[PDB]
UniProtKB/Swiss-Prot annotation:
Name this protein carries in UniProt: Cullin-7
Role summary: Core component of the 3M and Cul7-RING(FBXW8) complexes, which mediate the ubiquitination and subsequent proteasomal degradation of target proteins. Core component of the 3M complex, a complex required to regulate microtubule dynamics and genome integrity. It is unclear how the 3M complex regulates microtubules, it could act by controlling the level of a microtubule stabilizer. The Cul7-RING(FBXW8) complex alone lacks ubiquitination activity and does not promote polyubiquitination and proteasomal degradation of p53/TP53.
Part of the intact protein present: 360 to 435 of 1698
Disease: 3M syndrome 1: An autosomal recessive disorder characterized by severe pre- and postnatal growth retardation, facial dysmorphism, large head circumference, and normal intelligence and endocrine function. Skeletal changes include long slender tubular bones and tall vertebral bodies.
Family membership noted in the UniProt record: Belongs to the cullin family.
Domain notes: The CPH domain is essential for interaction with p53/TP53.
Domain CPH: 2-75
Post-translational modification (record): Structural study of the Cul7-RING(FBXW8) reveals that both CUL7 and RBX1 are in orientations that are incompatible with neddylation.
Assembly, per entry: Component of the 3M complex, composed of core components CUL7, CCDC8 and OBSL1. Component of the Cul7-RING(FBXW8) complex consisting of CUL7, RBX1, SKP1 and FBXW8. Within the Cul7-RING(FBXW8) complex interacts with FBXW8 and RBX1, but not with SKP1. Interacts with CUL1 (via the C-terminal domain); the interaction seems to be mediated by FBXW8; it is likely specific to FBXW8, but not other F-box proteins.
Domain of life of the native organism: Eukaryota
Location in the cell: Cytoplasm; Cytoplasm, Cytoskeleton, Microtubule organizing center, Centrosome; Cytoplasm, Perinuclear region; Golgi apparatus
Source organism of the structure: Homo sapiens
Expression by tissue: Highly expressed in fetal kidney and adult skeletal muscle. Also abundant in fetal brain, as well as in adult pancreas, kidney, placenta and heart. Detected in trophoblasts, lymphoblasts, osteoblasts, chondrocytes and skin fibroblasts.
Length: 77
């Protein structure tokens, strides 16, 4: 996947730059309460660590997700 990078942390970096509050996201991996295919919006992130604050639409819950499992659907505007 895009996390193809050696540790995949570069992917976290790549996405973090473009993922600003308002960029829509899709859950690419299935994890805990969240399920693969869930779609949501990027509210905010912790600018240096994996935890990202995303609001998932289909569930209706805000969750701290992981950069490497986020599919970008941004530029919706």
């Amino acid at each position: 996947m895009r996390s193809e990078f050696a540790s995949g942390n570069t992917y976290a970096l790549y996405v973090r730059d473009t993922l600003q509050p308002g960029m829509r996201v899709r859950m690419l991996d299935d994890y805990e309460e969240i399920s693969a295919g869930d779609e949501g919006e990027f509210r905010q992130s912790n600018n240096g660590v994996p935890p990202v604050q995303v609001f998932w639409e289909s569930t209706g819950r805000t969750y701290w997700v992981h950069w490497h499992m986020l599919e970008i659907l941004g530029f919706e505007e």
